[PDB]
Amino acid sequence: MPRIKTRRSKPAPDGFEKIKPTLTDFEIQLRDAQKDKSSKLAAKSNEQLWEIMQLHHQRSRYIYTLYYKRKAISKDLYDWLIKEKYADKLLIAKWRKTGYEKLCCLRCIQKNETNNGSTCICRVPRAQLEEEARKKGTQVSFHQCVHCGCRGCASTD
RNA sequence: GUUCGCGAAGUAACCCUUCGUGGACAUUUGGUCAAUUUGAAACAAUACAGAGAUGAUCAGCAGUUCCCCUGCAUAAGGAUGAACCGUUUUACAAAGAGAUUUA
Ligand SMILES: [Mg+2]
Ligand SMILES: [Mg+2]
Ligand SMILES: [Zn+2]
Numbered sequence: 681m682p683r684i685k686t687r688r689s690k691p692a693p694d695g696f697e698k699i700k701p702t703l704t705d706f707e708i709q710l711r712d713a714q715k716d717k718s719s720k721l722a723a724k725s726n727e728q729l730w731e732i733m734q735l736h737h738q739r740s741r742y743i744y745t746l747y748y749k750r751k752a753i754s755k756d757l758y759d760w761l762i763k764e765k766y767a768d769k770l771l772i773a774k775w776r777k778t779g780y781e782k783l784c785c786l787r788c789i790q791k792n793e794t795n796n797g798s799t800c801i802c803r804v805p806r807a808q809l810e811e812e813a814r815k816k817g818t819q820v821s822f823h824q825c826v827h828c829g830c831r832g833c834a835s836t837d
Numbered sequence: 838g839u840u841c842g843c844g845a846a847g848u849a850a851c852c853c854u855u856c857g858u859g860g861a862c863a864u865u866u867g868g869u870c871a872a873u874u875u876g877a878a879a880c881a882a883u884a885c886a887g888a889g890a891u892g893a894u895c896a897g898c899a900g901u902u903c904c905c906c907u908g909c910a911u912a913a914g915g916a917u918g919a920a921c922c923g924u925u926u927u928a929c930a931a932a933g934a935g936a937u938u939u940a
């Protein structure tokens with residue numbers, strides 16, 4: 681029941697046909713992303729992986745707004761879309777929290793993985809990174825987060 | 838972006854939107870590493886040389902070196918694995934004899 685339809689898979693509920701054209705359009709953008717473009721550069725190669733983290737994030741904001749913001753789908757369709765692995769359950773669970781409404785991924789708040797026990801730089805608000813920049817006179821030595829290619833996922837931002 | 842409070846607007850049995858404000862929430866990724874010739878795989882082929890002792894042909898096993906390869910290996914193999922089988926003058930005098938030689 682995660683991804684391919686088997687006999688143990690339950691039939692889809694009512695509102696799935698109206699959301700299915702957008703979910704098919706995310707699905708074919710991942711297939712172009714999965715394939716290897718033969719890239720010599722190390723900086724181009726993780727740039728391809730950032731497209732996968734973004735395409736994953738956007739399809740989960742799609743199902744999140746349909747149920748928690750617009751209420752356009754029944755809960756029986758939402759429980760089906762979680763079990764059939766359309767929407768990332770643990771990512772939606774942070775989006776419900778306060779301060780985490782626009783979080784890019786779960787790997788960027790995971791403190792144990794960092795050298796310093798900190799969050800990712802993409803979690804720091806753009807007002808604050810501009811401030812110590814004014815101390816130095818140099819703008820920003822930060823463009824994209826190494827694990828996501830996130831330009832800053834903070835709430836105020 | 839959410840939420841709490843505040844100040845207004847319009848709708849208004851004070852409710853719904855919208856604008857202006859205070860506080861809260863959330864807080865510093867990654868690299869010892871840049872994408873062909875100029876910071877360092879190897880082999881095969883070719884050319885030369887030829888794989889111990891001995892009168893001669895052979896089983897080998899060691900030790901020594903700022904020598905290794907194969908192997909999980911403290912096993913066993915790798916020409917008995919390889920390189921060593923070259924060069925070597927003073928802790929130095931005692932005894933005597935001749936000759937030279939000087940107060
Ligand atoms: Mg030997
Ligand atoms: Mg041997
Ligand atoms: Zn992230």
Ligand SMILES: [Zn+2]
Pocket residue numbers: 788800801802803825826827828830866
């Ligand atoms: Zn990040």
Ligand SMILES: [Zn+2]
Pocket residue numbers: 783784785788802803825828830831832833
């Ligand atoms: Zn981020």
